[PDB]
Amino acid sequence: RDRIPLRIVRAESELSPSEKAYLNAVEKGDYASVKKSLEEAEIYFKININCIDPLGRTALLIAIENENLELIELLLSF
Amino acid sequence: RDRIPLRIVRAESELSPSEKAYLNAVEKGDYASVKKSLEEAEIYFKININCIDPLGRTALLIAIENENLELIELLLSFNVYVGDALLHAIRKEVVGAVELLLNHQFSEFTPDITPIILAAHTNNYEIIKLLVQKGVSVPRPHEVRCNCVECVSSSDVDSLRHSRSRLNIYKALASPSLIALSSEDPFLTAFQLSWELQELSKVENEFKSEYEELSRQCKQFAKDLLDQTRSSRELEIILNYRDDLARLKLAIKYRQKEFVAQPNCQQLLASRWYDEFPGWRRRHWAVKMVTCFIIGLLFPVFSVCYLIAPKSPLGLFIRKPFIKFICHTASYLTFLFLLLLASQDLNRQGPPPTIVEWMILPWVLGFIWGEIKQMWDGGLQDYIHDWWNLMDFVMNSLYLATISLKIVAFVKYPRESWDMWHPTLVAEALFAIANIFSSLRLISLFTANSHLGPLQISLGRMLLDILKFLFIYCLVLLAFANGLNQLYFYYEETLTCKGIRCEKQNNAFSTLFETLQSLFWSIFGLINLYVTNVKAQHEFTEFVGATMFGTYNVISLVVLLNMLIAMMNNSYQLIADHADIEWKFARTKLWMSYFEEGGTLPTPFNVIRRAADNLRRHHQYQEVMRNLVKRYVAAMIRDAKTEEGLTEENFKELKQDISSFRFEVLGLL
Numbered sequence: 001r002d003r004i005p006l007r008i009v010r011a012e013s014e015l016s017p018s019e020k021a022y023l024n025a026v027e028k029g030d031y032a033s034v035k036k037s038l039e040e041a042e043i044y045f046k047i048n049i050n051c052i053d054p055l056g057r058t059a060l061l062i063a064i065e066n067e068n069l070e071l072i073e074l075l076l077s078f
Numbered sequence: 079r080d081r082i083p084l085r086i087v088r089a090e091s092e093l094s095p096s097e098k099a100y101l102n103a104v105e106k107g108d109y110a111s112v113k114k115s116l117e118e119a120e121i122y123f124k125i126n127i128n129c130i131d132p133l134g135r136t137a138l139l140i141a142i143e144n145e146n147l148e149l150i151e152l153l154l155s156f157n158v159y160v161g162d163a164l165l166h167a168i169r170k171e172v173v174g175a176v177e178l179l180l181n182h183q184f185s186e187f188t189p190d191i192t193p194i195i196l197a198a199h200t201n202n203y204e205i206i207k208l209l210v211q212k213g214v215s216v217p218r219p220h221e222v223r224c225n226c227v228e229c230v231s232s233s234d235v236d237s238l239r240h241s242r243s244r245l246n247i248y249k250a251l252a253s254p255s256l257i258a259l260s261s262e263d264p265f266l267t268a269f270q271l272s273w274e275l276q277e278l279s280k281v282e283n284e285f286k287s288e289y290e291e292l293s294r295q296c297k298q299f300a301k302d303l304l305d306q307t308r309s310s311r312e313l314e315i316i317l318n319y320r321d322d323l324a325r326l327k328l329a330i331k332y333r334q335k336e337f338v339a340q341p342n343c344q345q346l347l348a349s350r351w352y353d354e355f356p357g358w359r360r361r362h363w364a365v366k367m368v369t370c371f372i373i374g375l376l377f378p379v380f381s382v383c384y385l386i387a388p389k390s391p392l393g394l395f396i397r398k399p400f401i402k403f404i405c406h407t408a409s410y411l412t413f414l415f416l417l418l419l420a421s422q423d424l425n426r427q428g429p430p431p432t433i434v435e436w437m438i439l440p441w442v443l444g445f446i447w448g449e450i451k452q453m454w455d456g457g458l459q460d461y462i463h464d465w466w467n468l469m470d471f472v473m474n475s476l477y478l479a480t481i482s483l484k485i486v487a488f489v490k491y492p493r494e495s496w497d498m499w500h501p502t503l504v505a506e507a508l509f510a511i512a513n514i515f516s517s518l519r520l521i522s523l524f525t526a527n528s529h530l531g532p533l534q535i536s537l538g539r540m541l542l543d544i545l546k547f548l549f550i551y552c553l554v555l556l557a558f559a560n561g562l563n564q565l566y567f568y569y570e571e572t573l574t575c576k577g578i579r580c581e582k583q584n585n586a587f588s589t590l591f592e593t594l595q596s597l598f599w600s601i602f603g604l605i606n607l608y609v610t611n612v613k614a615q616h617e618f619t620e621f622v623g624a625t626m627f628g629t630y631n632v633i634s635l636v637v638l639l640n641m642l643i644a645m646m647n648n649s650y651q652l653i654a655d656h657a658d659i660e661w662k663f664a665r666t667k668l669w670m671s672y673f674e675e676g677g678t679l680p681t682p683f684n685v686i687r688r689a690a691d692n693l694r695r696h697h698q699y700q701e702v703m704r705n706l707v708k709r710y711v712a713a714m715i716r717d718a719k720t721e722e723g724l725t726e727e728n729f730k731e732l733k734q735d736i737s738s739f740r741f742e743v744l745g746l747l
C-alpha cells in the first residue's frame with residue numbers, strides 16, 4: 001500500500017445545508033437572517049431550534065460566545 | 079568612489095499605475111473599484127486577471143489574507159487562475175477554503191506540500207475535517223531503517239527534498255487533530271508514532287530536534303487525551319484495553335512518561351496497590367512502620383500459607399501487591415543480615431559453616447532462578463535496559479563463582495603459607511564483592527518511598543554523563559601515566575614492600591600498572607611527595623617528574639573536577655524539572671512488577687463467546703474514545719482562541735474590515 005487512505009472514523013451526524021446556513025447566520029450576527037431562520041423554524045420544518053453542531057455548538061452557545069445579547073434574547077424568546 | 083551607489087540587483091517587471099491602483103483597491107476593500115477594474119479586464123485593457131506582484135502576491139492571495147470572502151468569490155467568479163491559493167487559505171486558516179475547494183513560477187511552499195499535509199501542519203480541526211470529507215490521502219512513509227530501491231533512488235536524486243518530504247509527512251501524521259479525526263485508536267497511534275519519531279531522531283542526526291519535538295507532541299497529545307476522563311469506569315475501560323492493564327503496560331513499553339504519572343492513572347495504580355486497604359495512607363507514620371515491621375517479621379508464615387493454601391484469607395493476604403512488596407523487602411533484608419553474620423582459618427578446604435552459610439544458599443539459588451525466569455519472559459532487550467538487572471546478574475555470577483570455587487577447594491584441597499591465587503582466597507574475595515553488590519541493590523527500593531524516590535531517580539539519571547566525563551579523565555590519566563612511567567622506569571629498585579601501599583611509598587612510577595595506581599590515588603591525596611625522588615642525585619629528572627605530577631594534579635583536581643561539578647550542576651538543573659514524572663514512572667514499573675500473579679513467593683521459597691466479548695470490548699472502547707475525542711477537541715478549541723494572543727495580522731484584518739464597511743457605506747450614499 002502506497003498511500004494512507006484517511007477517512008473519518010468517528011462519523012457522527014452531519015447537518016442539512018439549511019441548518020448550516022442558520023448556524024453561520026447566528027455565527028455572523030445578522031439579526032434579520034436569524035429572525036427569518038427562526039420564523040421558518042416556528043413551523044415544523046427542517047430547520048429546528050435544537051440543532052447541535054458536530055463540533056458541539058448549539059446556536060444558543062454560538063450566540064453566547066459572540067456576546068450578542070440581542071441574539072441571545074431572540075433565541076430565548078423562541 | 080567615496081560613496082556606495084545602491085542599485086536594485088534583482089529587478090522585476092514591476093506594475094503599471096493602473097495595476098498598482100487595482101491592487102490597492104484589492105487591499106482597501108473597494109468592491110466597486112475591483113468590480114469596475116475586473117469589468118475593464120474582461121475587455122482588452124492593460125489590467126489582466128492573473129497579474130503577479132513583485133512580492134508574488136496575486137490579487138486572489140491578498141484577497142485571501144485580508145479575510146474578505148466577497149472579494150475571493152469575485153475573483154473566482156471571473157475565472158482567475160488558481161495555483162497554490164488553497165495552500166495560502168489553509169495556512170492562514172481561512173473559511174474561504176471551501177470556496178477554493180469547490181472552484182472547479184514562485185511558490186511560498188515546498189512542492190511536496192499538499193493541502194492535507196499543510197492542514198495537518200496548521201492543526202486546524204475544521205480544515206482537516208473538510209479535506210478528509212472531500213477525500214485526501216497522506217503518502218505512507220517507509221520504515222525508519224530501510225534500504226529499498228525507491229528510497230536510495232530518491233536520495234541519489236535529491237536527499238534534501240527526500241528528507242524534507244519525510245519530515246513533512248511525519249509532521250502531518252503527528253498532529254493531534256489528524257489522529258483525533260482519522261485514526262481508529264488514537265492512543266495506540268500516538269504511542270507508535272512517538273516511538274517511530276524517537277527512532278527517526280536517533281537515525282536522522284540532522285532534523286533531530288524536529289523529530290524529538292514531534293515525539294514530545296505525540297506524548298503530550300496522549301496525556302491530554304487521557305486527561306479528559308470523567309469517570310473511573312472510562313479509565314478502567316481505556317487502561318485494560320487489548321486488541322490486567324494492557325494499555326498501561328503498552329504505555330510503559332513505549333516510554334510514555336506523561337500518559338503515566340497522571341493523577342487518575344496514579345490513583346488507579348494506588349487503588350490496585352493497597353487493594354482492600356481502606357484508609358491506609360490516612361494513618362500516622364509510626365503505626366505504618368509498626369505494621370510494616372509486623373508484616374516484615376511475618377514473611378515466612380505468609381509464604382508457607384501461600385505455598386500450602388492459596389485460597390485461604392492468609393493465603394490471599396500475600397496476594398496483595400503492597401504486602402508482597404513488604405514480604406520481598408523483608409526477605410532481602412534477612413538475606414543481607416545473614417551476609418552481615420557471615421562477615422562476622424588454617425584449612426585449605428573451606429566447608430560451609432554449619433549454621434551461617436548453609437541457609438544462605440537457598441537465597442542465592444532463588445535469586446538465580448528468579449533471574450532466569452525473568453529473563454525467559456519479556457526478552458533480553460529489557461533485561462539489558464535495566465541497570466539493576468545488570469547489577470544483580472553480576473552479583474549472581476559472582477555468587478555462582480564462589481559456589482564453584484568452594485566446591486573445587488573442597489574436592490581438591492596455615493593461611494600465611496598459601497599461594498596468592500588459592501581458590502579459597504579468590505572465593506572469599508568474590509564473596510566480598512558480591513556482598514557489596516547485594517547490599518548496594520538496596521537503593522532500588524527507594525523508588526517506593528516518596529522522599530528518596532525522585533532523588534534516587536535523578537542521581538541514577540546523571541550516570542551516563544558521569545561515564546562520559548570518566549572516559550575523558552581516563553584518557554588524561556592514561557596520557558600522564560604513560561609519560562611518568564616513561565620517565566621513571568629507569569630507576570626501579572628491588573625491601574619487602576614495592577609499591578604505594580606501605581608506609582615508605584616507593585617505586586610509584588616504575589611500573590605502568592603502579593603508575594596508574596599512583597595517579598589514581600593522587601586525587602584523594604594518598605600519594606606522598608617522596609615518590610617522585612630517585613636514589614641517584616638526578617635533580618633534573620626529579621624536577622621534571624614532579625612537574626608532571628603537579629600538572630596532573632592541577633588538571634585532575636582544579637580543572638577536571640570543577641568541570642565535572644559544573645556539568646553535574648547543569649544536568650541536575652535540567653532533570654529536576656521532570657523529577658516527579660520520572661519517579662512516578664519508575665514507581666509504576668516497580669508496582670506493576672508486583673501486580674502480576676506470578677512470582678508471588680519470595681526468593682527463599684520461589685524455587686519450591688470470545689468474538690462477542692471482543693466485539694463488546696471494541697464497541698465500549700470506541701464509545702469511550704468518541705467521548706474523549708469530542709472533549710479533547712472542544713477543550714483545545716477553547717484553549718486555542720484564548721492563549722494565542724493578537725498578532726499584526728488580526729489588526730490588519732480589523733483595518734480591512736472597517737475600511738470595507740466604510741467603503742460600502744460610501745457606495746450606499
Ligand SMILES: CCCCCCCCCCCCCCCC(=O)OC[C@H](COP(=O)(O)O)OC(=O)CCCCCCCCCCCCCCC
Pocket residue numbers: 554620621622624625626627628629630632633636637
Ligand atoms: C586535559 C585537557 C584539559 C586541561 C588542559 C590544561 C589546563 C590546565 C593547565 C595547567 C598547567 C600546569 C600549571 C602548573 C602546574 C605545575 O606543573 O607546577 C609544578 C611546579 C612545582 O614543581 P615541583 O613539582 O618540582 O615542586 O610549580 C612551580 O614551579 C611553582 C610556580 C608555578 C606554579 C604555577 C601554578 C599555576 C596554577 C596551578 C594551580 C591552580 C590552583 C588554583 C586553586 C585556587
Ligand SMILES: CC(C)CCC[C@@H](C)[C@H]1CC[C@H]2[C@@H]3CC=C4C[C@@H](OC(=O)CCC(=O)O)CC[C@]4(C)[C@H]3CC[C@]12C
Pocket residue numbers: 407411414415418520523524526527528
Ligand atoms: C543492615 C540491613 C539490615 C539493612 C539496613 C537498612 C534497611 C533496614 C532499610 C534501608 C532502606 C530501607 C527501605 C527504604 C524505603 C522503603 C519504602 C517504604 O515503603 C513505602 O514507601 C511503600 C509504598 C508507599 O508507602 O506508598 C518503607 C520500606 C522501604 C522498602 C525500606 C525498608 C527498610 C530498608 C531496606
Ligand SMILES: [Ca+2]
Pocket residue numbers: 449452466467470
Ligand atoms: Ca532482577
Ligand SMILES: [Zn+2]
Pocket residue numbers: 220221224225226228229
Ligand atoms: Zn524505503
